[PDB]
Design an enzyme around this catalytic site. Structure first.
Site, PDB file in Angstrom:
ATOM      1  N   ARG A  45       0.804  -1.224   0.000  1.00 22.63           N
ATOM      2  CA  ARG A  45       0.000   0.000   0.000  1.00 22.63           C
ATOM      3  C   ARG A  45       0.838   1.275   0.000  1.00 22.63           C
ATOM      4  NH1 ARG A  45      -5.019  -1.533   4.270  1.00 22.63           N
ATOM      5  NH2 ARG A  45      -5.685  -3.349   3.014  1.00 22.63           N
TER       6      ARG A  45
ATOM      7  N   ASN B  58       1.775  -5.743  -2.559  1.00 23.36           N
ATOM      8  CA  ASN B  58       0.349  -5.956  -2.348  1.00 23.36           C
ATOM      9  C   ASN B  58      -0.398  -4.630  -2.376  1.00 23.36           C
ATOM     10  OD1 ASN B  58      -2.087  -7.584  -1.313  1.00 23.36           O
ATOM     11  ND2 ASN B  58      -1.802  -6.066   0.338  1.00 23.36           N
ATOM     12  N   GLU B  59      -1.481  -4.577  -3.146  1.00 24.70           N
ATOM     13  CA  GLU B  59      -2.347  -3.397  -3.205  1.00 24.70           C
ATOM     14  C   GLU B  59      -1.537  -2.125  -3.459  1.00 24.70           C
ATOM     15  OE1 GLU B  59      -4.900  -3.581   0.295  1.00 24.70           O
ATOM     16  OE2 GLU B  59      -6.179  -5.056  -0.692  1.00 24.70           O
ATOM     17  N   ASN B  60      -0.678  -2.189  -4.468  1.00 25.69           N
ATOM     18  CA  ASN B  60       0.141  -1.031  -4.803  1.00 25.69           C
ATOM     19  C   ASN B  60      -0.633   0.058  -5.525  1.00 25.69           C
ATOM     20  OD1 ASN B  60       2.485  -3.528  -5.088  1.00 25.69           O
ATOM     21  ND2 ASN B  60       2.694  -1.823  -3.629  1.00 25.69           N
TER      22      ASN B  60
ATOM     23  N   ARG C 162      -0.427  -8.846  -5.900  1.00 23.70           N
ATOM     24  CA  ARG C 162      -1.857  -8.895  -5.655  1.00 23.70           C
ATOM     25  C   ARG C 162      -2.434  -7.488  -5.758  1.00 23.70           C
ATOM     26  NH1 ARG C 162      -5.469  -7.649  -1.802  1.00 23.70           N
ATOM     27  NH2 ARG C 162      -7.484  -8.627  -2.250  1.00 23.70           N
TER      28      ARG C 162
END
Ligand code: PRO
Ligand SMILES: [K+]
Ligand SMILES: [K+]
Ligand code: NA
Ligand code: NA
Ligand code: NA
Lengths: 788, 799, 166
Positions: free
Chosen positions: B372, B408-410, B447
């Site tokens: 994030r 993840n969730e970039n 992801r």
């Protein structure tokens, strides 16, 4: 740095949020955040300023007080009344390292918890309000401030010191609007001839002129204590840039500043251009001071024995974050005790305190926080230099100030793996020289660094007769020896700890002598006799400049977790909440003239001893004669006489009856033609007690939503254990909460018993609670508290 | 390092002191201090390692968890068994920024909470011991360590993440003695011919040789799964400096590593000189993996549906400071549920976890904590590059690992005032390129960052059917659409929150009587997020996903999120505050009802589980036919209600829910006994389960009081129960009101565990709440609060 | 600004028997590029044991500051007479970072030798709707071997190195 000589200061007290801890970056203070989002944590606490990180945890008995970073944020509604004016944030004081942000822009920083400083945020504000980002802030300006009191060996003061190095915005933070041209500094340099008949005033100024205005008209006016003009002069077309000498004048037959009748002149300055008229005021006083070589202190040509105390910026419930009204109350309380001199702890204090000393007539010794540990590197030395200059430049106008202190107990080592006396001497002499360059009219001083006692003008050793050294009857002898060692001797710091409300029969001369060395029981009874002795001796020491008791008021310190009140220095004559101790009245009876009278034992509910013992009763009074009545029976009139120790002759030995007794004292002061009286009620217990076996817990009284709980240690037969000092621990479950973490013997959830008892108040919240009471090796006791 | 030493490796667990906060300088850690002096404060706490700053305050409901500095100190008793040997401090992991001091000398630092690292302290130890300052430490060496988990936008992971960025020495810290010559790295590169009948093993090493020894004899031996030698070779007079290729060999007919039969080879390396013989071991396994384009996943040539979960390094009472025994219990528990695949949360995890995956047969996706927030500057990017390289180099040898995750969730913004998709794409491809340079035998993945879904080998979108999106019955349709967007689709993260011990009648298909012969009515429970967070809803949600997966032959697989409840700083208002409750296992290892759903579908060992083991009181009308679910892998099951058989039913995954093993039965008012008996023909085994449940027909009004009672005792421990009741004393069985526990006296609440029975503030489960009190053999009073209700009290006395 | 000040923390050493010269003493080129180009071209070749089979791997790194998502890349390999021996277009490739563009086998490759130096040419083109950009890189097939305690062999034949320096 400066305190800003301004007329229009807005205290920013409301609408702040506080976070204990650090942000990952300034973006976290101002980025968009939706409810329930990841941005909505950490959770901040709403607060008002001033605020201190350590309002509770300094005296919390189970935690190290917080030393680390914290953040504040608010939204400023900006509205400058001056055309093309400046916007300034003016810090009365913040601990210890502070960084200031307007939106995401770093605008200023400061290292030093005790000096005043400010930041001009005009440009950052204009750029923000003109940016795309202003809209989501609805026309307001986000202000975010980081304060940090992390431990730092290369920063003064040292964590070895006997006080908390507090953090936060614990003095007022001001929003100050300015016109284009104002004063950055106003120096009112006055001197008084030896014969007191001629005063000289020099008015020097530095201009704040970021717009580079070339000309202005400046008016200097000086008014006397009756607000009458004594001088007025307008300088037309002066260059309002940098330093300017505005006026030099001679005032014949000046009204003098004195500790009995403090009188101040007022200097009024106006700066005019076609676009502004800006006026501010600064006060000063004429007075002459002299320290005699190997002799006493003279104020305006008269010997004045300095009757001194100390204070820390610390108070119950708020730590360093005292308000102006709290400061006014404390300084008035000192004046009502007869104080005429104060050493302001180990650092520069709020300008409010200095103004009150000017107005009440209290001479001031003020020092930099070079307080224990040795000597650090360049950043350390620059801080000490900067804080000394800031202190002198910021406070030099105050007539109360007579001494700039350069440090305390600098012979105390171990903040570094070396301790170099010659380097300390060298830096000490550099500070002394710098102070004399900045202000040649006041004396420098230090306390307790013998290998530097040749460097400063005024020197104080460590003399704690009857507490840390010998017996208090050695006081005069030790002082005479110490005074011979330096040109100007002045004794700052003496006294003893007393656990408020703890009293001791063994400290009295009861019939059927008490030692003069540290009472291992920390009773008020011992400290009262110690103070009495010191004050009696000072009447026979005509060579003595004076002394300062340490401290006026109980204050928190991180190095005493095990004191009867944990984390509180209990040498005060006043409790941390302003409640006077018995010792307050000893000073008052010796140092004031307004008639007063105080039977010792107002917080002593139960005395004890054998049947028909003749118990000693002390009365502290400035009355010429006093008559004592015990249960209505006169015990005889006695005449006051300081040298007839103790109690200046006003002591009796009287039989108490078992159970309740009433003691009444009636005094007359002929000068005032006034009669005054006092009365206390004390129970007298002849039953002896065995070891402590249980805690009896009961509801003592109620006031509104508040319950006063009392704990009494008793032995296996229910007899009060009147000498017990066992620690009592309070816990609560239910709707109420303990009124604790106040740093007083009745506001502590862990506290040593006083004569076997302990008190605490519960805020009931109009609901039901159960209080539990613990004490080592005893059964835990319980009390139910319901609301009406 | 790791696993490159073995027995000269000492875990430093005892004799530590911990300070929450910062020192003014290293001198304060080691200077003389007398009792009662100014140096005697601040007061430190004695602790055992591993230790985490946040063991309690992560789930404490009233405070932000601590992010800041902390210090540890100990006295090392050093006695090196090797001649002229080395002393190394070896960190399994510490959060987040760490500085290490020997006396006053700074000897090393590290930024990164999840990778392994070490410091050779030989010279600093020798310098200290030879100084006059050594004497007052009586032959020991003072070791002081600063850990810091301050928030830092320029450090990964992001504080926007849904987990705690923990601080402290929360993985083992090892004292490692070494001889002059040892291995800095052992790289075991194995590959398989297309027909799987021939294996190639290359043994590459890096030497640690600070004394510049010129020659050594190095022996390489490889032992098979039965510990029999298959290769042994000594290189005489080799240069033990820098990199050396030690051996390349062919192993014919290798035993393959598999998720049902994990089999490992052992490579044993010995370094000999005249003054040393040093031997260590490293394991590896032969296996072949393949992702089909727009198709499924193959292990050793056979289609394998990945049956996955996740885990965080977090546990009740210790936060990240889990012990080896705790990790062995948790991974064993996963295997017993039938897991064959795990994504190890959002960061490199303890080597112990990787060893357990190799031994238990669990394939691994492991990623760096680029989790994030966007993209920071150069320090940020160097940390990410370094953590990817450290993770691949440190874990390369594990046959379990098939995927290196890059983030993840970039696509999640707002750690910076800009969000530049093209810069994120550019850095993403750089990390992708670097992983393939370091290890071309494994796939990279991310992801949920669609604008990067062209960069990585394997991609997972966000699919939370029935929780964050739509109804869980759309799961298969959504999966089909998503798999078409990328060459290799793999679905990580799905599921739902359940407040353990909270159950819901409305989540079941219950039959009511409608008034000759009466007819039957039942509302159909919705397939969208249960606003009540009941176990009853999650069980059905999991059930549906697993049933659909049997008809998805193109599917590589999925990973449920997570295995175990874990703490998260962004959910202060959860039924258990600050706990992500999507697990099928409670934060203390207690299985939830949902654990058995997975187990009934994924294992062969006979089991049978009636839903409702933690459901004490059901409710409804007198003659309602209540739905009863049994989760079992038996071929057939018979249900008995109060001794009356309700019929045998045959298991059939597609007969949803409960794979046909569901009944509708009348409960009698009061206590009921439900018994289920199943037989699994393959094993010729019979198994049974039984639960006892009360049935309440009385309806309840609003909550009016808290009834508090001592439910049971065990030694010095009391189990207290709270029941919300209405004005007539009827239990409010649907209540979710928050309950607050307080205590005064000799005992203490057993709270801050992050479980529904170890929390001093917790939402009620069907109107009740439990907590344990440690009585300390004394007297206490417990108070129980709930908004708008009168506070209740319970006394606890001891004998 | 160029600087050849003496610097003990910079190689080479001023103890060396040559001048550490200063200035822009090799060509400085102005290069115009389209949006998408090659930052590096690696032509990795190997030669079979019997010299009859050659392997060429074509690896590239893209320069793509505008973050273009797709491009068409052509790999062509020409022999010593500019005759094509391999040509392949990758349509819709991601022109970002590293890419392996081609791996090929060349039967009976012409060898590079000190008497008959022969070079192959690899030609790469990157096309989008807004650009066509072509560049060339050369390589050669040859086998080298240093014998343990023995001489040097080029393409299987002993070659004594007849060398100098400059
Ligand atoms: O190089 C590899 O991929 C194998 C996998 C397990 C051990 N080494
Ligand atoms: K404290
Ligand atoms: K928390
Ligand atoms: Na300090
Ligand atoms: Na971060
Ligand atoms: Na050089």
């Amino acid at each position: 740095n400066a305190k800003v000589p301004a007329m229009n200061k807005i205290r920013l007290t409301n609408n702040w949020e506080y976070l204990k801890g650090d942000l990952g970056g300034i973006w976290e203070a101002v980025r968009p955040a939706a409810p329930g989002s990841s941005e909505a944590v950490p959770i901040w606490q709403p607060v008002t300023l001033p605020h201190c990180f350590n309002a509770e945890d300094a005296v919390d008995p189970d935690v190290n007080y917080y030393e680390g970073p914290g953040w504040y944020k608010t939204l400023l509604a900006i509205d400058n009344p001056y055309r093309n004016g400046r916007i300034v944030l003016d810090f009365d004081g913040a601990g210890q390292k502070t960084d200031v942000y307007v939106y995401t822009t770093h605008v200023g920083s400061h290292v030093g918890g005790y000096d005043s400083w400010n930041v001009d945020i005009t440009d950052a504000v204009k750029a923000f309000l003109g940016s795309k980002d202003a809209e989501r802030f609805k026309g307001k300006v986000p202000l975010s401030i980081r304060c940090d009191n992390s431990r730092d060996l290369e920063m003064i003061p040292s964590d070895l010191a006997d006080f908390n190095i507090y953090g936060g915005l614990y003095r007022y933070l001001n929003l100050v609007y300015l016109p284009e041209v104002s004063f950055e500094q106003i120096h009112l340099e006055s001197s008084l001839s030896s014969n007191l008949k001629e005063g000289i005033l020099k008015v020097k100024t530095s201009f704040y002129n970021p717009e580079d205005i070339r000309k202005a008209d400046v008016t200097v006016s000086v008014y006397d204590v009756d607000r009458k003009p004594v001088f007025s002069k307008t300088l037309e077309g002066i260059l309002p840039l940098g330093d300017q000498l505005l006026a030099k004048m001679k005032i014949k037959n000046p009204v003098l500043w004195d500790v009995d009748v403090p009188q101040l002149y007022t200097c009024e300055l106006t700066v005019k251009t076609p676009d502004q008229t800006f006026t501010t005021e600064e006060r000063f006083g004429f007075r002459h001071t002299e320290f005699k070589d190997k002799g006493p202190f003279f104020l305006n040509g008269k010997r004045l024995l300095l009757r001194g105390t100390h204070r820390h910026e610390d108070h119950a419930g708020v730590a360093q974050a005292m308000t102006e009204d709290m400061m006014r109350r404390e300084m008035r309380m000192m004046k009502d005790m007869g104080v005429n001199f104060i050493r302001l702890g180990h650092y520069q204090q709020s300008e409010i305190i200095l103004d009150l000393c000017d107005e009440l007539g209290i001479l001031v010794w003020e020092e930099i926080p070079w307080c224990r540990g040795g000597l650090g590197g360049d950043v350390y030395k620059k801080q000490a230099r900067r804080m000394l200059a800031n202190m002198i430049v910021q406070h030099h106008n105050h007539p109360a100030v007579i001494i700039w202190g350069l440090g305390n107990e600098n012979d105390w080592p171990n903040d570094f793996n070396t301790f170099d006396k010659s380097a300390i001497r060298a830096f000490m002499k550099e500070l002394h020289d710098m102070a004399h360059r900045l202000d040649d009219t006041r004396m420098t001083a230090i306390r307790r660094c013998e290998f530097c006692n040749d460097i400063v003008d005024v020197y104080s050793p460590s003399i704690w007769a009857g507490w840390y050294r010998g017996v208090f009857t050695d006081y005069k002898s030790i002082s005479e020896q110490e005074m011979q060692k330096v040109k100007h001797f002045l004794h700052v710091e003496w006294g003893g700890d007393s656990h408020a409300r703890r009293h001791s029969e063994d400290a009295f001369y009861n019939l059927k002598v008490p030692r003069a060395s540290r009472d291992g029981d920390w009773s008020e009874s011992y400290v009262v006799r110690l103070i009495d002795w010191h004050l009696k001796e000072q009447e026979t020491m005509p060579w003595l400049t004076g002394t300062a008791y340490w401290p006026f008021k109980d204050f928190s310190t991180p190095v005493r977790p095990d004191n009867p009140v944990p984390y509180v220095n209990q040498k005060g004559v006043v409790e941390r909440d302003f409640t006077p101790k018995e010792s307050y009245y000893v000073f008052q009876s010796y140092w004031t003239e307004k008639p007063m009278i105080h039977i010792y034992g107002h917080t002593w509910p139960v005395r004890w001893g054998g049947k028909d013992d003749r118990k000693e009763i002390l009365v502290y009074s400035n009355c010429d004669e006093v008559e004592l009545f015990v249960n209505g029976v006169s015990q005889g009139v006695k005449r006051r006489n300081s040298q007839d120790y103790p109690a200046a002759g006003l002591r009796w030995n009287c039989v108490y009856q078992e159970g309740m007794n009433e003691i009444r004292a009636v005094g007359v002061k002929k000068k005032e033609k006034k009669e005054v009286s006092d009365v206390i009620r004390q129970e007298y217990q002849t039953a002896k007690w065995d070891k402590e076996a249980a805690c009896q817990v009961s509801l003592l009284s109620e006031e509104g939503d508040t319950a006063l709980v009392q704990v009494q240690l008793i032995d296996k037969n229910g007899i009060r254990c009147l000498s017990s000092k066992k620690q009592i621990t309070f816990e609560i479950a239910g709707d109420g909460s303990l009124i604790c973490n106040l740093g007083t013997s009745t506001g502590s959830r862990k506290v040593q018993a006083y004569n076997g008892r302990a008190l605490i108040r519960i805020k009931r919240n109009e609901g039901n609670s159960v209080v539990a009471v613990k004490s080592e090796g005893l059964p835990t006791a319980f009390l139910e508290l319901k609301s009406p």
